[PDB]
Amino acid sequence: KLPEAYAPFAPIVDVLPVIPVFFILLAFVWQAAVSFR
Amino acid sequence: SSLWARFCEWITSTENRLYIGWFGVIMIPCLLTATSVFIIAFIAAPPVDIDGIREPVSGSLLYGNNIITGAVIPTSNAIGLHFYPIWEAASLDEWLYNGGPYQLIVCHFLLGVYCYMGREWELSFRLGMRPWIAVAYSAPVAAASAVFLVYPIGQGSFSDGMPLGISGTFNFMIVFQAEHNILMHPFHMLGVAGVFGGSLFSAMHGSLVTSSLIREEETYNIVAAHGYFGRLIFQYASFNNSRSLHFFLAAWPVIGIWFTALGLSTMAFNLNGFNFNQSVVDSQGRVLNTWADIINRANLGMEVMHERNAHNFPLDLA
Amino acid sequence: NIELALTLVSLVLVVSAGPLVVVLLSARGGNL
Amino acid sequence: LVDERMNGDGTGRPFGVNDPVLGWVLLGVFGTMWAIWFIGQKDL
Amino acid sequence: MEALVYTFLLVGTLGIIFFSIFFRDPPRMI
Amino acid sequence: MTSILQVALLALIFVSFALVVGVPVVFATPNGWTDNKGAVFSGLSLWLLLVFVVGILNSFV
Amino acid sequence: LTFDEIQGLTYLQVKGSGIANTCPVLESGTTNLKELKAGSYKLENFCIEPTSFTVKEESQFKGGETEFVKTKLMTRLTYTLDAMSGSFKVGSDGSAELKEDDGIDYAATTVQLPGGERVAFLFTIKQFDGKGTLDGIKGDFLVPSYRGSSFLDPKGRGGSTGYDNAVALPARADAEELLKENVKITKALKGSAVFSVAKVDPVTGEIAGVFESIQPSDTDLGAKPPKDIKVTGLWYAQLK
Amino acid sequence: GRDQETTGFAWWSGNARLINLSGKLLGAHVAHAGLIVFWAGAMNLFEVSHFVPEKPMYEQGLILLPHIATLGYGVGPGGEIIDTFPYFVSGVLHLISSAVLGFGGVYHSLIGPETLEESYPFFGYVWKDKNKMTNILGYHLIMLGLGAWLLVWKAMYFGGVYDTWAPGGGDVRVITNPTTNAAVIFGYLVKSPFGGDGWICSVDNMEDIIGGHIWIGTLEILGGIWHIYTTPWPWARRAFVWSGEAYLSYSLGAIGVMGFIACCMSWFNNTAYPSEFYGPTGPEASQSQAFTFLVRDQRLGANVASAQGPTGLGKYLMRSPTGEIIFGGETMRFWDFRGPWLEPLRGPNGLDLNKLKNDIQPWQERRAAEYMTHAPLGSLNSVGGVATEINAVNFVSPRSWLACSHFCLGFFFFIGHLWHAGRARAAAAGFEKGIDRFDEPVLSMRPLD
Amino acid sequence: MLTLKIFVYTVVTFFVCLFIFGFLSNDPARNPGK
Amino acid sequence: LTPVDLFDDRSVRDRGFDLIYEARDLDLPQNVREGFTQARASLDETKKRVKESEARIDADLDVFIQKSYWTEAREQLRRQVGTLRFDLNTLASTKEKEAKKAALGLRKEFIQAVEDLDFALREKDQASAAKKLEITKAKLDSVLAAVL
Ligand code: CLA
Ligand code: CLA
Ligand SMILES: CC1=C(/C=C/C(C)=C/C=C/C(C)=C/C=C/C=C(C)/C=C/C=C(C)/C=C/C2=C(C)CCCC2(C)C)C(C)(C)CCC1
Ligand SMILES: CC1=C(/C=C/C(C)=C/C=C/C(C)=C/C=C/C=C(C)/C=C/C=C(C)/C=C/C2=C(C)CCCC2(C)C)C(C)(C)CCC1
Ligand SMILES: CC1=C(/C=C/C(C)=C/C=C/C(C)=C/C=C/C=C(C)/C=C/C=C(C)/C=C/C2=C(C)CCCC2(C)C)C(C)(C)CCC1
Ligand SMILES: [Cl-]
Ligand SMILES: [Cl-]
């Protein structure tokens, strides 16, 4: 488990690992706003 | 002119009835070697102890067997993944008894199919064609590699490799599901979709073009010229581009076969398909059986039977 | 369930960050 | 023992060379081929 | 002699493939 | 103290999220970086400073 | 390779060499056997390396006498009995008793005789009770069934575990096929072995010599008649 | 940004519009590095948070922590995890580092110049400029050499890597005599990939591992200096395609092979991948089962030495085709397996039934029993079990995950090599787009048949 | 059977050499046109 | 038709017959399954095992080195001596402050010696192994004096 001081921050660390997969999705979103020039 | 240069030309010569190439230089001999041994083995090869239990399974048309039953017995389990060159065998008879031909054929065959892929690109570059025909041929080659190399390696024996025969292929498929539940593997599902879909697309594309060119004109130029597009059931514009349609005609089947091949490779590392046995439970805990459980019942039967005398311990970790 | 609740709160804020940047940039005629 | 075998299987011999001849032939064949390639088309 | 019959069939099929590649009708058409 | 490190870590998280959205905006904003780069530097300096504080707090916690 | 020489080599150095399928050689010691003190000694590290496997076979002529014929081993090595412990004694006279107790006393071996016929046999001296002189210690040994009762045939019919009937042909499930179905006889047979001490190393308490044994071949659980297999080779043991 | 009308590449090939944009290309690569470092840090902290000291790491589906544990961090005698804070430090460091790389990439992708050659000549580079390309390779070659030497330093200094084969028990050991003999270091390279030889996967001693990294470290640094002060020779220029896609295809092909090798390493090697943290290997699990029953039956009163099986090839023990005494059963295929728990009972000739009869230590049993249960066999839904098993155990060997994932990665990257390489060669020729419709080569070729 | 090994080893080397040296023979110039 | 023969093997459980089953009980903590907790709990049992390892290191091993039985000597190390490191650690843990620290220091100096001797066996150097073994014996005796 995370140190006691960093324990209250467990929920955040549970969401961090999935952040990278969102970046590729954001790319397609940007192209959508760009209208896929 | 330097003779080596002269030779290099003849090798890259396009005037050859069958384009030879630097890849062919290695492909031709390897495949010729595998074909010769395969023909002699499928006809006169003596029995082989595939299970390494001193129980030799008969093979070749001479030793009984038949076109359907006949097959090239995989190498003995005793050898495992060890290299078994003819010269390593004390006598050619031992090489046949241990199941050496199978290893030799597979080795001289896989190299050939890989070189066949390279030869495809070689001619495409020589003719001035795009270089992705081989990528499509990579899908079948990948599948063959998994059944004749990746899986044998993952399991830890060439005996696990698919036998070079009709009945042997069926045996390999059955035991595989009994131990990996390939049917419940999402990748195998993609592969089945690829072949089932590929057949559907092939039948439709063939029918559309045939009905059109029924008469050099574009595959559908005729129907397009009439303008009576069947958008009634073909209400779409994604494949209006012939290049777009043909691309899909290649992507769908190839990508599917790639997944099924990778699926087989993953299962070769003991990554079996979804296991939902006893997943549905009632309030008090009684197990409510499902179709999955019924499939498991069959898998158990194949498991308890496969290698009747080749298991001295309960768990089949191997 | 407080941990799970604040976990979902974090997921919402983080996931909304990327679209937030785009929407804002698009709104102010940014270089997107 | 009852029979004679190379006894090379399982041994990690470089390029499966269990006899000096094997090693010499491999280098010799490559050297001749290199000479032909270099003479036919100089490398550098 | 069933094996002899089987070998004949296999050999015959291969022979057809042979002529189908080297003794095939010249592809005058594209 | 645990509270000091936790509070400081929370502050770093807030500053981080601000930069996560603010930096890309300023960078892609027409003439929004040449005039706001200094403000970005101020925010970036605070973020790195908070990182150091959290680390020091860890040793004293 | 003497026992100590083998001990010096690591498993990896021995792995792939094949020396593991070879009994240690008593290079030291004396050819004389008189020095061998009279008494009972633990037959530890008893190894039997078969030099040759001959199978008795009628001469070419239909009535040709059945003589042992040369054969070619099909099973890569894996035929040297080793790590066998037993009881060996010697009297003031030539009286010598060699009794095998446990260890790798058995070793399945499939050899091909001239004519492409593979004859499988379980090379073994289980329960050997030799009681001849220091040389020619004649004795008899057990020859357990090559296959166990559990062993199932291709048809699935077997001894303790098996169909016992030709399930394939329902109408002919039970008939003259009885010899092959519901038989699966696993009764053990007997074989004769003779051992002779070529040399004795009194200082190291190690003995080595030649062995000769004729044992029945596999009977396919009674499906086929057994065939005499004459196995001759060298034996090494440490009397400690 | 950019549009297809000005690049000829559609949105699905947008990153291909950055080939000649050195500045933007820098941002893209730098940013991607941020993503990699991010996951390394994020997942590590996630594992640390989801870690429990009552279970082995392999049972907890942890993949990153085993790596740090092998480096000899927060581990103790027997592989027991003493503390996890070192692992937390690694996650925090990587996570914060990823921020720096992320900012650099974003900057070099937005504010940064699309090209650098015009402003920063050193960074400025043009595909085909072999001299510059070789120099760039040199810089990175030196970097990798330094990284390998950092590992070598950790082995002989700043503590030591965990040695599963450590004398008197497995624990971290400071390598003091790393193998530098070229014959031993390069022997693995010329070893057959078949069974027994196991090519480089056979490495079982940390001394060779550290010594091998010493060799690769030096060669890479020297090679970098060479490529930094040398330009491709005529033979090379006449036998290679000089283009960005061609250079990428070369890397794709190489990294693809490396992926396959890594898969085999994780599935077969137990030294570089301690079974204590990564769990038992396929062969290890099989041998463990044979040992478990052999011990149990022997205690019940069975002579495993003279125990003929149904086939008659020995129920518990038998002889390898080579001659070495090996465990009986289908595990005969894994007779070449070597584990720190089985070596003590082995000897010059295969196993030593003497040790098997007496001297079998309790740990040798407990370890085998645990490995047998935690075999690599598993399902996609993580239902631990050989197969045809009920949904009761939730475990999939980390080795299985790494082996399957990296194999698939290697396969795709090899396909990428074929795609990029072929396109690069076609591009150079000029027929990448298609046939001229006026200079069709076939029309000028012999009518063949 | 070493003679068989020596022969195979030579045969293999020869074909492999042809492939390597063959591609070294300015293969990229085999393009139909440019 | 014969009744299945029955044998009184209740003594097997006494001779660690449930070791495998206990190690395979996932419900038990990993330390319990490995037996680490049990040993740490049984001080006398741990101390005994330590003395057994001492005998193997002292009144043994030298034999193989004399006859160049490297395989056996290297296997002599580990095996029963395999737990020695864990054993010495828990005994030192019994100590406190400086006592524990000093004991751990002796444990480390000994562990280093056993590795030096093992490397000598790896290089099959009898002379180095002989002298190295003597050094290892002294180191162990020092650690034993502190841990015991
Ligand atoms: C590793 C993933 C990755 C990366 C690093 C890049 C990087 C890049 N792409 Mg790209 N792209 C990707 C994936 C990726 N792409 C995918 C999957 C697709 C297919 C949909 C595309 C399709 C695509 C096209 C069609 C184009 C690019 C272009 C570009 C370049 C400039 C982008 C632009 O012009 O406007 C920038 C975009 C934005 C400003 C919108 C938001 C992007 C920001 C920078 C992301 C930051 C997120 C993060 C939370 C910020 C952290 C801040 C920090 C303080 C924490 C740039 C170097 C353009 C180009 O240069 O062509 C020559 C272009 O035309 N891409
Ligand atoms: C570091 C490796 C690498 C790099 C730098 C590139 C770079 C490039 N590739 Mg490429 N490729 C690679 C690996 C790589 N590739 C591999 C391994 C394969 C085999 C699958 C391919 C197959 C491939 C094809 C078929 C094509 C390219 C193309 C391109 C160019 C267009 C970029 C683009 O699509 O714009 C923007 C980025 C995108 C549109 C990507 C969209 C995001 C993808 C589709 C989602 C995939 C998510 C994935 C499932 C997550 C799991 C990944 C992994 C764990 C399995 C570009 C320069 C195109 C080209 O024309 O070449 C010049 C093209 O046709 N590549
Ligand atoms: C680490 C950390 C940080 C940071 C974080 C982050 C990084 C955030 C952001 C994140 C992100 C980055 C987000 C984003 C995501 C994405 C999204 C949200 C999208 C989605 C989309 C969809 C779902 C759809 C799509 C589509 C379209 C629209 C187009 C076409 C294609 C498709 C169909 C696909 C913080 C501050 C917390 C602090 C602490 C630490
Ligand atoms: C260019 C572009 C792109 C993108 C790119 C990218 C990918 C970017 C990224 C970048 C990045 C890469 C970012 C990141 C960030 C992160 C961060 C910033 C972090 C932070 C951290 C913190 C704040 C802290 C935390 C903590 C610790 C460590 C301790 C414990 C607790 C906690 C966890 C809380 C795209 C695709 C759209 C396309 C278009 C263009
Ligand atoms: C660390 C360590 C170590 C070491 C390792 C090593 C030493 C590695 C290296 C490896 C290597 C050594 C790599 C390299 C690679 C390279 C290659 C493999 C080559 C390739 C080539 C190419 C790719 C080319 C081709 C071609 C031809 C020739 C013809 C024309 C065309 C072209 C040019 C394309 C050891 C073992 C102790 C283990 C432990 C750890
Ligand atoms: Cl079967
Ligand atoms: Cl088994």
Side-chain angles (χ1 to χ4, degrees), chain H residues 248-254 412-422:
Chain H
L248 176 59
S249 72
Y250 311 149
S251 296
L252 294 178
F412 284 121
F413 273 72
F414 161 68
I415 271 57
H417 162 78
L418 307 175
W419 174 279
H420 290 268

Side-chain angles (χ1 to χ4, degrees), chain J residues 54-103:
Chain J
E54 171 189 6
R56 292 207 173 189
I57 302 303
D58 304 3
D60 193 6
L61 173 53
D62 48 5
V63 39
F64 320 113
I65 307 182
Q66 155 63 202
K67 277 160 299 307
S68 300
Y69 301 157
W70 314 104
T71 170
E72 318 301 342
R74 310 194 86 267
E75 305 301 8
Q76 173 71 6
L77 278 58
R78 306 161 177 88
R79 190 97 105 272
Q80 183 276 345
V81 188
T83 68
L84 186 49
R85 302 196 183 189
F86 175 87
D87 312 348
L88 298 175
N89 192 3
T90 183
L91 303 182
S93 304
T94 308
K95 292 62 165 303
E96 58 182 0
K97 195 200 75 294
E98 177 181 0
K100 181 164 48 183
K101 301 183 303 181

Side-chain angles (χ1 to χ4, degrees), chain B residues 53-54 93-94 308-309, chain G residues 72 76 108 112 147 152-153:
Chain B
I53 61 179
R54 295 307 184 87
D93 299 17
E94 165 193 339
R308 57 190 181 271
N309 308 329
Chain G
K72 53 172 57 181
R76 311 172 59 180
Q112 171 181 340
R147 301 297 190 179
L152 280 87
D153 82 328

Side-chain angles (χ1 to χ4, degrees), chain G residues 1-3 5-6 22-28 206 208 234 236:
Chain G
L1 289 175
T2 76
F3 176 90
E5 297 180 7
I6 309 174
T22 73
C23 66
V25 46
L26 185 58
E27 305 178 2
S28 180
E206 299 177 357
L234 307 179
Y236 165 92

Side-chain angles (χ1 to χ4, degrees), chain A residues 12 16 19 21-33 36, chain C residues 10 13-19, chain F residues 12-18 20-21 47, chain H residues 11 38 42 95 98:
Chain A
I12 315 175
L16 299 180
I19 303 320
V21 76
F22 295 119
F23 276 95
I24 188 171
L25 302 166
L26 184 55
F28 292 82
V29 172
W30 161 61
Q31 283 301 308
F36 298 83
Chain C
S10 177
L13 308 176
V14 173
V15 73
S16 59
Chain F
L12 182 57
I13 303 172
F14 314 137
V15 173
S16 181
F17 197 94
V20 165
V21 177
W47 189 90
Chain H
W11 72 270
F38 180 91
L95 183 56
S98 72

Side-chain angles (χ1 to χ4, degrees), chain A residues 2 6 9 12-13 16 19-20 23-28 30-31, chain F residues 9-10 12-17 19-20 47 51 54, chain H residues 15 27-28 30-36 38 45 88 91-93 95-103 105-107 109-110:
Chain A
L2 301 178
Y6 305 91
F9 308 81
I12 315 175
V13 76
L16 299 180
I19 303 320
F23 276 95
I24 188 171
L25 302 166
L26 184 55
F28 292 82
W30 161 61
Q31 283 301 308
Chain F
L9 183 50
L10 295 167
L12 182 57
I13 303 172
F14 314 137
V15 173
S16 181
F17 197 94
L19 301 174
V20 165
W47 189 90
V51 175
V54 176
Chain H
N15 297 352
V30 170
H32 186 279
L35 293 170
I36 307 182
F38 180 91
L45 296 175
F88 171 77
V92 169
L93 271 41
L95 183 56
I96 312 303
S97 306
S98 72
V100 176
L101 302 175
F103 175 86
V106 169
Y107 162 76
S109 299
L110 305 185

Side-chain angles (χ1 to χ4, degrees), chain G residues 100-119:
Chain G
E100 134 69 7
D101 301 355
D102 198 1
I104 316 176
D105 48 6
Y106 66 112
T109 304
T110 300
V111 76
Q112 171 181 340
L113 55 89
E117 174 184 1
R118 287 93 160 270
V119 41

Side-chain angles (χ1 to χ4, degrees), chain H residues 53-56 58-59 77-78 80 165-174 176-177 179 205 207-208 292-293 295-296 299-301 343-348 352 355 359 361-367 369-370 372-374 393, chain J residues 9 11-13 15-26 28-38 40 56 71-72 74-86 89 107 111 114-116 118-119 122-123:
Chain H
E54 305 79 10
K55 297 176 52 183
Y58 60 81
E59 295 186 21
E80 190 167 357
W165 311 84
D171 55 344
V172 294
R173 176 178 55 89
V174 173
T176 61
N177 306 143
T179 301
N205 43 359
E207 303 291 353
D208 296 11
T292 301
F293 290 95
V295 169
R296 179 200 65 175
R299 183 180 299 96
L300 292 170
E343 303 315 312
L345 311 171
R346 307 183 186 182
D352 310 349
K355 285 72 173 183
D359 203 358
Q361 309 301 337
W363 60 269
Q364 300 171 346
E365 306 178 0
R366 287 180 173 267
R367 226 52 176 269
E370 301 187 11
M372 184 193 64
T373 53
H374 302 98
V393 174
Chain J
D9 301 7
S11 183
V12 304
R13 192 160 302 180
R15 40 180 169 271
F17 178 82
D18 305 7
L19 290 181
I20 52 179
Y21 289 93
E22 165 190 352
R24 297 173 294 182
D25 183 1
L26 273 55
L28 299 179
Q30 175 60 7
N31 288 351
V32 165
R33 293 174 285 180
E34 288 287 11
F36 291 135
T37 297
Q38 291 79 345
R40 290 185 291 262
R56 292 207 173 189
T71 170
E72 318 301 342
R74 310 194 86 267
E75 305 301 8
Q76 173 71 6
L77 278 58
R78 306 161 177 88
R79 190 97 105 272
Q80 183 276 345
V81 188
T83 68
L84 186 49
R85 302 196 183 189
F86 175 87
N89 192 3
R107 179 173 175 269
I111 299 312
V114 316
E115 299 171 353
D116 307 347
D118 191 29
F119 184 72
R122 178 172 178 265
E123 291 182 329

